[PDB]
Each structure stands twice: as C-alpha cells, then as structure tokens.
TrEMBL record, chains D, E:
Part of the full-length chain shown: 509 to 661 of 860
Annotated spans, Fusion peptide: 1-21
Sections of the chain in a coiled coil: 101-132
Protein name per UniProt: Transmembrane protein gp41
Compartments, as annotated in UniProt: Virion membrane; Host cell membrane; Host endosome membrane
Organism: Human immunodeficiency virus type 1 (HIV-1)
Gene name, Swiss-Prot/TrEMBL: env
Positions of region (Immunosuppression): 42-60
Membrane topology summary: Single-pass type I membrane protein
Ranges for domain Retroviral envelope protein GP41-like: 19-132
Transmembrane segments: 1-24
Superkingdom: Viruses
S-S bonds: C66-C72
Sugar attachment sites: N79, N86, N93, N105
Length: 451, 125, 112, 132, 132, 53
C-alpha cells in the first residue's frame, strides 16, 4: 500500500562485543608523591560526578562466568606488576653458601623459625670482599650437605629481583571506562545470581571503584550484598566448580606482627644496596590473626541457611579444613603493610550443622621470597619493615568447594579453596556487560523521493 | 531529558525524535599508552565507514532519509499501524536481519546509481 | 627581490636555422601550490606584446607550433625550430611566484 | 588569464583586514586543518588527535543545514541583546579577531537549540512528501 | 531469469574497458579506499595515513560544488587542457589509464579553476541573491 | 691507594669513540591546525605587546 524503504541513523540498537577499556582515577589521592605498584600517571582523571541513566522496558541477559572484563583486568594487573619491578636492584650475587645457626635468645615457643646466617658478600670495589650477617626465616633457606651449610631456596630456579623500596602495595580504586561507540550495562536486580535475564537494566557511563585486593580462601574489602547472603556458581551440580559466597554483613579481622624488627643496609655494588634484618629488640612472638566467635557463628549460620535451599531440606552441612597442596593454596595468604602472611584457617571451618568476647586466634607465618601469579622463574624479595605492623580488614566473601559425595545425600562437606585470581574479581565485575552500538536501520514509511 | 540511549524501551514513534543524542555519542574526545591509540583509530574508522555507506546512497547529511525503493525484499509481513506504535527498535532488528544485505544493495544500484544517471543526461540539453 | 639574467644579449639567427636562448633566476621559482611561474614574452617592434610560453613548458594561445620551452628550476631555455622573418624583436622572462614581478634583461634577435 | 602566483594572500594573511574582506579567503585557512618507541608515539598521538578534532566540526556542521559549505546562512533570528550594531560597523569597521571576543559568552545559546531547528525542518519535510 | 554470479566484475574488473563502461562501476572502487611497540606502531601508522588520504580527498571533493556525489558535472568550460580529441573518440575508444597518462601535468591548472571560478563565485552570488 | 670518584654512586658508560659533540642547527616546525607567530620588533624585551607580527 505504497510503502517504501526509509533510512534512519542513530537508532538505539546494541549488540554484544569485546573491546579494550581504560582508566579513571579520583583526584583526591592522585596528586600525592607516593608511588604505587599500580600506576596512576598513565590513567586519566575521572569525571567529577557519574552519569546514571535508567532504562525502562529493557530486559538483557547477563553471564558472570563468560565475561572478558575479568580476563582484561587479570592481564592489566599482571602487566602492571611486571612493569613495577624493572628500574631497580636485582639480587644476583646472593647465591652463596651460608653458615646458619639458631637464633635462640627469647623463644616463647617459634623454635626454629628464625636463623642467624653469615656469608661473604662483594663490596663497591671489585677486588675486595666483606663479611656480613643477616636473619632469614626457615621457609627461605634450604640445607645443603653448630654451624651448618644452607642456601637460598631460589638459587637453582632463577636469580630474581629485589622489591623496589620506593613503591607501596596498598590497593587503590580503579574505574574501567568503555570507548566511544560502546556502552556499559549495569544490572540493578538485588537478588541476581549473575546468570540469566536482569529486570533492572541501567546504562552506566563507567564502573565504580574496584580495589585489586589479592587474597586466597577469603575476600577482603569487597562489595557487600543488599538483601541476603548470595551463593553463585556456574554449575551447582558439578563438584569441580568453585562456589562464591557474598556476605550481607562483614566480620572484622585484626592481624599483627609482635616482633620489633631492625633493617640494615648492605652495599653490594656501585649504587646497589641490600636490606637485611640485623637484630630483633624486645621479645620474639608469633604473628596471629583473630576473629570474633559470635559474629562468625552467626555469619556461618546464615550461610548454611541460604545454602540449604539448593541441595535439599534434611541434609547436614559440614565444614572442614583444606585438603593439601602448596602453602599458597592451603593457607589464607594476604598482605599487611608490605609483609606477606600465611595464616592457618583450620579453626574457622570446623563445625557440623543439624537441621533441628572470645576470639579465634589463627597462627600465621611470614615469608620473604614469594612467587605469585602462579608463575615459575620470578620472585619478589620483600625487604624487612622496621617497627610493628597492624591491619584491620573486612571479610566480605568466601570461596568454598565441594567434595565427591557418597550415597547421593545425607552429607555435604564444604572446604575452602582458591588459587586463581580471576575468582577474586569475578565477585565484583558480575553486574557489568559491554555492548556495541549499531545506529543504522531501515523501516517502511510512505515517502517517495522527488524525481 | 532522556540522555544517551534513553528511548531504548520506548516505541518507534518516540525513539525517532532523539536520534541526535545517539548521533553525537559515536564520536567523543606500554599499558594505557597504546590502548587508547588503537581504540580511537578503530572508533574513527567505524564512524567513517558508516558515514560513507550513508552517502553512497542519496542520504548524505540527513538524520531521517526516505527513498523510493519498494517494500519487496524485506518481508516484514506487517502493516505500518502496529509497527510504529507496538514495537521497539530492538525487536525490529530481530525480525529483519537476514534481509539487511539484499536491501543494502537495492539502495546502491536501484537507487542513486541509476537515479544519478538520468540527471547527468537531463542537465545536458 | 629576485633578479633575472638573460644570455645572450644579441643572437643573430639565420632565417631557417634552430636557435636557443636562456634565462636564470637567483632563487627557486616553485610556488606553494606546486607550480613554477615563468613567462616568455615576445616584444615585436611597433606591435602589441605576445605571450609565447607560460608555466615554463606550456604553449599559450597562438604560437603556431613553432616555439617551445623547457626547464626544471633556476635554468630555463626557449627553442625555436624553423625561424621565419617575423621572429625579430626582444624576448623577456618574467617571474610570478613572488612580488615584485621582475622582468629579464633582454635578447635582441636580428637576421644575419 | 593563465594565472600568477604572486596575487595570493597566504595563511592568515587577512587577519588584520575587516570582516567583510577576510570572508573571501576562507579556503586558505580551511585547507590547513587537514595537512600532514619514544618520540614515535607522541607524533602519532598528535596526528590522531588532529584527525578526530576536525571531524567533530564537520559533524556539528552535519546537523544544522550547512554540509559541505563554507558560507551558509540559516533562518535563526538575531535579537538586539546579542550585539546591538548596524551592518556598516560590523562588516566594515571590525576584525574577525575583535568579533570573537565580543560574541564569546553568547555563543553556546546560538550553537545550541536556537540553531538546531533542523529537527523542525526534517519532520516538516517528510510529512509533505507523504501527501500525493 | 538470472541465477549466475560470474558476471560480477569485482574490484578493478573494468580497468581495461572503455570510459562508457568503467563509469558504471564507481561504487566498487569507492568501497576499497576504506577497508577493515614494533609492528604495532607500523600497522597503526598505516591506518592513520589511509584515513588522512581519504579525508583530504573528501575535502577536495567538496571545496568545489561536488559534496556527496560520485558523478558530478560542473560549470567550467573545457580549455584548461587543450586536447583536440572530441567526445566520440574519448568515451568509446579510450580507457581511464590512458586518459590519466594524457592529462598528467595539465591537472593542477584544472584544480584551480574549480575552487575559484566554479564554487566560490557561485556561493557568493547565491548569498547575495537571498540578501537582495 | 686511590679510587675513582663515582664508585659509590654509579658505574657509568664510556662515550662512544666515533660520535662527536659538535652542535648542528635544528629548526622547529608547527603541526596542522597550529601556527607560529614571530615578533619582528627590533627593540623587543620579552614581556609586552609586539606591534610587528
Ligand atoms: C647473630 O649472630 C651474630 C654473630 O655472627 C650476633 O652478633 C647477633 O647478635 C646474632 N643475632 C641474634 C638475633 O642472635
Ligand atoms: C668467607 O671467606 C673467607 C675466606 O676469604 C672464609 O674463611 C670464610 O669462612 C667465609 N665465610 C663464610 C663462608 O661464611
Ligand atoms: C540463576 O537464576 C536463574 C533464574 O532466572 C535460573 O534459571 C538459573 O538456573 C540460576 N543459576 C543457577 C546456577 O542455579
Ligand atoms: C553441570 O553438571 C552436570 C553434572 O555433572 C552435567 O551433567 C552437566 O553437563 C553440567 N553442565 C550444564 C548443566 O550446563
Ligand atoms: C621498636 O623499636 C624502636 C627503635 O628501633 C622504638 O622506637 C619503638 O618504640 C619500638 N616499638 C615498640 C612497640 O616497642
Ligand atoms: C579489632 O580491633 C578493634 C579496635 O581497633 C576492636 O574494636 C575489634 O573488636 C577487634 N576485633 C577482634 C576480632 O578482636
Ligand atoms: C523445607 O521444608 C520447609 C518446612 O519444614 C519448607 O518451608 C521449605 O519450603 C522446604 N524447602 C524446600 C522444599 O526446598
Ligand atoms: C586439616 O586438619 C587435619 C586434622 O583433622 C590436619 O591433620 C591437617 O594437617 C589439616 N590441614 C591443613 C591444610 O591445615
Ligand atoms: C595448620 O594447623 C594444623 C592443625 O591445627 C596443622 O596440622 C598444620 O600443619 C598447620 N599448617 C598448615 C600449613 O596447614
Ligand atoms: C574442631 O574442633 C574440635 C573441638 O574443639 C577439636 O577437637 C578438633 O580438633 C577441631 N578440628 C581440627 C581439624 O582442628
Ligand atoms: C556456634 O558454633 C557451634 C559450632 O562449634 C554450633 O554447634 C552452634 O550451633 C553455633 N551457635 C549458634 C547459635 O548457631
Ligand atoms: C568494613 O565494613 C564497614 C561496614 O560494616 C565499613 O563501615 C568499613 O568502612 C569497612 N572497612 C573497610 C572497607 O576497610
Ligand atoms: C513498559 O511496559 C509497561 C507494561 O506493558 C507499559 O505500560 C509501559 O508503557 C512501557 N513503557 C513505555 C515507556 O512504553
Ligand atoms: C522480490 O520478492 C521476491 C519474492 O520472493 C524475490 O524472489 C525477489 O528476489 C525480490 N526482489 C529482489 C530485488 O530481491
Ligand atoms: C495489514 O496488517 C494488518 C495487521 O495489523 C492485517 O490484519 C491486514 O490484513 C493487513 N492488510 C493487508 C492488505 O495485508
Ligand atoms: C537468515 O539466515 C540465517 C543463517 O542461515 C538463518 O538462521 C535465519 O533463519 C535466516 N532468516 C530467516 C528469517 O529465516
Ligand atoms: C590595515 O589597515 C589599513 C587601513 O588603512 C588597510 O588599508 C590595510 O589593507 C590593512 N591591512 C591588511 C593586510 O588588510
Ligand atoms: C533574544 O535571544 C537571546 C538569546 O540569548 C535572549 O537572551 C534575549 O532575551 C532575546 N530577546 C528577546 C526574546 O526579546
Ligand atoms: C544604525 O544606522 C541608523 C541610520 O542608518 C541609525 O539611526 C542608528 O542609530 C544606527 N545604529 C546604531 C546602533 O548606532
Ligand atoms: C563574557 O562572560 C564571561 C563570563 O565569565 C566574562 O568573563 C567575559 O568578560 C564576558 N565578555 C565580555 C566581553 O564582557
Ligand atoms: C578487450 O579488447 C577487445 C578487443 O579490443 C574487446 O573486444 C573487448 O571487449 C575488451 N574487453 C572488455 C572487457 O571490454
Ligand atoms: C584556456 O585555453 C587556452 C587554449 O589552450 C589556454 O592557453 C589557456 O591557458 C586556458 N585557460 C586557462 C585558465 O588555463
Ligand atoms: C569531432 O567530430 C568529428 C568526428 O570525429 C571530427 O571530424 C571533428 O574534427 C571532431 N571535432 C573537433 C573539434 O576536432
Ligand atoms: C609534464 O611536465 C613537463 C614539464 O616538466 C612537460 O614538458 C610535459 O608536457 C608534461 N606532460 C603532460 C602529459 O602534460
């Protein structure tokens, strides 16, 4: 009935696509003269106020387990960490034999944790040598066949780099923004499991502040829920998929290192220095972390109540400790002010639940030669820190796992897991999606072009 | 004000009045040293190709442009009455997506290529 | 300004032999729009001036298939193949690439 | 009648002339907007930034009614509250540099909804074509 | 009816055919002008250059009166390049590759009579006509 | 016994024995869309208006 093709430009149509995002950093702490391992000089300042646009009658489909933003964030974090350790001292001449002996002195019983080692080291002049001593943890030295012979644990895999002493490891919020022609969709559904149609879709200019916190078996300083404890998994039937838990209310954890350290500088070359622990003044005590018993019990009860819905109605829920493996996957590993902790989370996951001012002290261990990002051939030798360190944090999540069930029911045991850093950022980049705007369309009107 | 992509759930009759909002948002202005330098070039090239395609037709600098191609290839099987008042632009792309490569060639041969030839032979005299 | 040198000053040409002159400039005559501005003017006695060759090597109006010029930059030549009796007068080279417009010296051609 | 290159006012050569005389030399400043490890990225960044900045003016000319034109007139009225002046003292006694500092804080109103009246000319034109 | 696809000439297919045939395939060659750390900078620079060349060509085609047309015929008489070939032996007995060799250095004095006497004079009179 | 003066700060590179330190003139040009303005006044003193541009 006299209908002809009409071209419209600028129609609101979008399709799924993958692109590269950039920074947006707050200007409050952007101007300070403090260097961080996550660079800020290459990130543009953020907008003074975000622009939130609500979409009516729009129903999009999200999927938290197939998002490219997590992979891009992982690549950027790894690249930043690799770039932050370049311009300064490399500890190649430290692969020498050592004459180590027990520290003793004040031992509360840390019997063999610390060792007093002496060695020969080069000086600024090429033809002279100096004899110095340093204190090393038991997790860094390996005996080679009373003053016995020891050696560093990395002296047969790779000569590594010393951590730059001018940088800091404190996380800072990072915003990711899409380029022109691309939009970010935000799911505002409070009860969303990360996978499926979202009723409340809202166009957001960028993202919020996401702190790159590195931890295992627990989530520290994350995003809390709004209504109830949320359990999200890719396949709840499969036992080979990790389970992500989000806490409604955060519990408090305090960590400290009671020893008062003392850092001394040793010159190993022209313009190069090595930082060692000379003496410990005071008393020697173990590092520990504490969790309030009642708040943890209430949080675990809420987790059990919200976990009962998926599995059954009369099955018992049991919590056990880790199974085995490396030290980084069986302990709660984190960073407190520049010192790396490895805490024993065995008194936390120890309960059995039936359908019918105390604190929990967690012993921890400290290591100086670490190897993160699950790589082989690179270290990050953290220098000693003078004084006493303390940290107060929030526990706003869990990474649980399930064992192979027997008799198909009547028991379900959950133990903590971890190891992969993508699960840390999947818990925060779950409400976001990237789309590509297509502005060209055709529709039938009754125009005929003048001839 | 509805803002960018404000009329995404609105009908076709109310979404065609805000084409200017989405028209201007398609062109705005070592880690993070080559990311932008490769994103902006792609953003420029995606816009230039669309502006060349819209213009090898007879529609050069107009946001709404209606031509003289009959409604034969694109089988909507639906009348204008329940299209501009009972459907949104997102649902339209789901129906006509197979016929958007045999309608982009009827706008380049049956229109503004033949049409540009009798005009060249009529200003001759 | 830019000076123009014309060599020679007096060129006796036989009626029916090839002839050639030259003109040189102190600076490059290339202009910003990618053109070289050279004009060859024939100044017959008691007659209006005539433009023989414009833009170095392009034939102007008239010039009945006889006069031709060539040159790249700062060195230009004019060639006459079949000299007749009417080709008696003065020849000048003028620039146009930069103010002021400066003419050439001159080249008197007479029948020998 | 063949052309002399000496009669050519160069780049910005009419910057001291009046507004009525500097308006015939727009092509000279129009053509110059598009000409041509470390120390190999900053030049590329400058070139990319120069390309995407010229396009933002051509898109702004895409709306309104001035596409592919240097001198284009519209039908937007001018009130006396912008510059109460005659036509014999703007185009004959004023420079383009002196005009861009008088009408400088009144340009966002002109550049906006007042001149984007083409939306009232594209829906007023397709309705006429849909009537035979 | 028709059910074959071998009749499609393709990109640069009509490069040996005459002028009257090569003028109906302009859209095919109009598409391919815009197609889509060491090595990374090399490829990125090539993309920027391609865009700049296209933008310069589209600016030249539009400083004249021909803004968005592939076949655009103007108001300049034919004396700029005095090729004595008439209309019959050009559009039927020659190709574009021989025409480009024929008018190769008489091409800068044609590009100057299209932006000075063709469009610049026309839009000045059109502006003055509505001014009255 | 003596030592070099830099042995407690850095160990620095020798100068290449083929390069030279003779300066050569360098001209600076402007990109597209920009311009360079030159003051042709003869008694110019830095700060202040220039009537010959
Ligand atoms: C380590 O041994 C050195 C002697 O080599 C001694 O001076 C120092 O006090 C010892 N440090 C501790 C903590 O016992
Ligand atoms: C350091 O070298 C000396 C010889 O110069 C040796 O007597 C001493 O035992 C060495 N110290 C060690 C291996 O700790
Ligand atoms: C998430 O919720 C949706 C309901 O919209 C449901 O279809 C889906 O199975 C849920 N995912 C899991 C892993 O249970
Ligand atoms: C989820 O796990 C079950 C049980 O192992 C398996 O059969 C199924 O293929 C998995 N994937 C799904 C449901 O997408
Ligand atoms: C640790 O030792 C330093 C001196 O090195 C002292 O100033 C500080 O007060 C000590 N800290 C405690 C808690 O005793
Ligand atoms: C951690 O320390 C704060 C004081 O800074 C205290 O209020 C809180 O109870 C402590 N947490 C635990 C679990 O003891
Ligand atoms: C479990 O049983 C309770 C009643 O005891 C009921 O309210 C609840 O819906 C049941 N949950 C199921 C069947 O998943
Ligand atoms: C877990 O607890 C058992 C005691 O039942 C203990 O033997 C084992 O070493 C513990 N594993 C870890 C990783 O703490
Ligand atoms: C943690 O504690 C358990 C028992 O409390 C102990 O068997 C284990 O060796 C400790 N360390 C690790 C790394 O599991
Ligand atoms: C769990 O708690 C009980 C009661 O205190 C204790 O006997 C048991 O050893 C604990 N389990 C582990 C693995 O330490
Ligand atoms: C506290 O934790 C114990 C596990 O040792 C559990 O049996 C008890 O039910 C918990 N209390 C409450 C009120 O849930
Ligand atoms: C921990 O959570 C509380 C809210 O319960 C909040 O006030 C506090 O700032 C959080 N601490 C952080 C984010 O370090
Ligand atoms: C959204 O859907 C409701 C339910 O049909 C409808 O009443 C409303 O008009 C829709 N919104 C818009 C903007 O049309
Ligand atoms: C017009 O519609 C008929 C119906 O099938 C189809 O065969 C024909 O190809 C269409 N015309 C064009 C140019 O696509
Ligand atoms: C026009 O479309 C309507 C659907 O709204 C349909 O009922 C009617 O039959 C159509 N008319 C023709 C002539 O196809
Ligand atoms: C268009 O082609 C695709 C791919 O073969 C097909 O899936 C789709 O159904 C076609 N469109 C229609 C309307 O059948
Ligand atoms: C400068 O002003 C005078 C006024 O007498 C005018 O004649 C001259 O043309 C102006 N300069 C330029 C470059 O237009
Ligand atoms: C004319 O338009 C300007 C636009 O800024 C406005 O300020 C002024 O009041 C207007 N005068 C009228 C409407 O009389
Ligand atoms: C404009 O000129 C007229 C006479 O031509 C005069 O009456 C009027 O005052 C002038 N306007 C101004 C603002 O001077
Ligand atoms: C235009 O308004 C701005 C407002 O900040 C002011 O600074 C400026 O002086 C005004 N222009 C004139 C010519 O007064
Ligand atoms: C090639 O040349 C032959 C003879 O000159 C001619 O018949 C033929 O048409 C030409 N090819 C094309 C594609 O025109
Ligand atoms: C006009 O044609 C004549 C004859 O060839 C030529 O000499 C002259 O240069 C042409 N005009 C222009 C402006 O090129
Ligand atoms: C073109 O027309 C005829 C046909 O070839 C030819 O004789 C004539 O000389 C040509 N015209 C001119 C002006 O040369
Ligand atoms: C090219 O330019 C030269 C002068 O440099 C001239 O002699 C020749 O005729 C020109 N070629 C054409 C095809 O115009």
């Amino acid at each position: 009935e006299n209908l002809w093709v009409t071209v419209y430009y600028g129609v609101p149509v979008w399709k799924d696509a993958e692109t590269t995002l950039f920074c947006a950093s707050d200007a409050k702490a952007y101007e300070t003269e403090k260097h961080n391992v996550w660079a800020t000089h290459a990130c543009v300042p953020t907008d003074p106020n975000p622009q939130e646009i609500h979409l009516e009658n729009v129903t999009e489909e999200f999927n938290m387990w197939k998002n490219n933003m997590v992979e891009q964030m992982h690549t950027d974090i790894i690249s930043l960490w690799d770039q932050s350790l370049k311009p300064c001292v490399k500890l190649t001449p430290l692969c020498v034999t050592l004459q180590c002996t027990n520290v003793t002195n004040n031992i509360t019983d840390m019997r063999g944790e610390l060792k007093n080692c002496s060695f020969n080291m080069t000086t600024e002049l090429r033809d002279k040598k100096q004899k110095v001593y340093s204190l090393f943890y038991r997790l860094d030295v390996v005996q080679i066949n009373s003053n016995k012979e020891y050696r560093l644990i990395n002296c047969n895999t790779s000569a590594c780099t010393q951590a730059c002493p001018k940088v800091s490891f404190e996380p800072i919020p990072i915003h990711y923004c899409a380029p022109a022609g691309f939009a970010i969709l935000k799911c505002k559904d409070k009860k969303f499991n990360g996978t499926g149609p979202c009723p409340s879709v809202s166009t957001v200019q960028c993202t919020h502040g996401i702190k790159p916190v590195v931890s295992t078996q627990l989530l520290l300083n994350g995003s809390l829920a709004e209504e109830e404890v949320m359990i999200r998994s890719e396949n709840i039937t499969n036992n080979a998929k990790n389970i992500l838990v989000q806490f409604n209310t955060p519990v408090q954890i305090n960590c400290t290192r009671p020893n008062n350290n003392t850092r001394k500088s040793i010159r190993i070359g022209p313009g190069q220095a090595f930082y060692a622990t000379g003496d410990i003044i005071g008393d020697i005590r173990q590092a520990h972390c504490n969790v309030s018993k009642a708040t943890w019990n209430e949080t675990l009860g809420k987790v059990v109540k919200q976990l009962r819905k998926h599995f059954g109605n009369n099955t018992i829920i049991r919590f056990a400790n880790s199974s085995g493996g490396d030290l980084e996957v069986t302990t709660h590993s984190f960073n407190c002010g520049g010192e790396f902790f490895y805490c024993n989370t065995s008194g936390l996951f120890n309960s059995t639940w039936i359908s019918n001012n105390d604190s929990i002290t967690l012993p921890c261990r400290i290591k100086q030669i670490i190897n993160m990002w699950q790589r082989i051939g690179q270290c990050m030798y953290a220098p000693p820190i003078q004084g006493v360190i303390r940290c107060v944090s929030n526990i706003t999540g869990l990474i649980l796992t399930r064992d192979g069930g027997s008799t198909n029911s009547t028991t379900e045991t959950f133990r903590p897991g971890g190891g992969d850093m993508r699960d840390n950022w999947r818990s925060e980049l779950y409400k976001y999606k990237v789309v590509k705007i297509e502005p060209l369309g055709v529709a039938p009107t009754r125009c005929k072009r003048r001839v | 004000f509805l803002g960018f992509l404000g009329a995404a759930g609105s009908t076709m009759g109310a979404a065609s009045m805000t084409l200017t909002v989405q028209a201007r948002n398609l062109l705005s202005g070592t880690v993070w040293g080559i990311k932008q330098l490769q994103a902006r070039v792609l953003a420029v090239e995606r816009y230039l190709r669309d502006q060349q395609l819209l213009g090898i037709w007879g529609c050069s600098g107009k946001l709404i442009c209606c031509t003289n191609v009959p409604w034969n290839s694109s089988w909507s099987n639906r009348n204008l009455s329940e299209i501009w008042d009972n459907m949104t632009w997102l649902q339209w792309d789901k129906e006509i997506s197979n016929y958007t490569q045999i309608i982009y060639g009827l706008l380049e041969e049956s229109q503004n290529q033949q049409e540009k030839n009798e005009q060249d032979l009529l200003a001759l005299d | 300004d830019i000076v123009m040198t014309q060599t020679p000053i007096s060129l006796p040409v036989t009626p029916g032999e090839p002839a050639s002159m030259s003109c040189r400039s102190s600076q490059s005559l290339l202009h910003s729009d990618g053109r070289t501005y050279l004009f060859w003017y024939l100044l017959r006695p008691a007659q209006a001036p005539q433009l023989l060759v414009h833009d170095v090597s392009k034939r102007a109006s008239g010039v009945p298939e006889r006069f031709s010029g060539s040159g790249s930059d700062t060195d230009f030549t004019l060639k006459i193949s079949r000299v007749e009796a009417e080709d008696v007068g003065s020849y000048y080279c003028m620039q146009g690439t930069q103010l002021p417009l400066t003419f050439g010296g001159g080249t008197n051609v007479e029948i020998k």
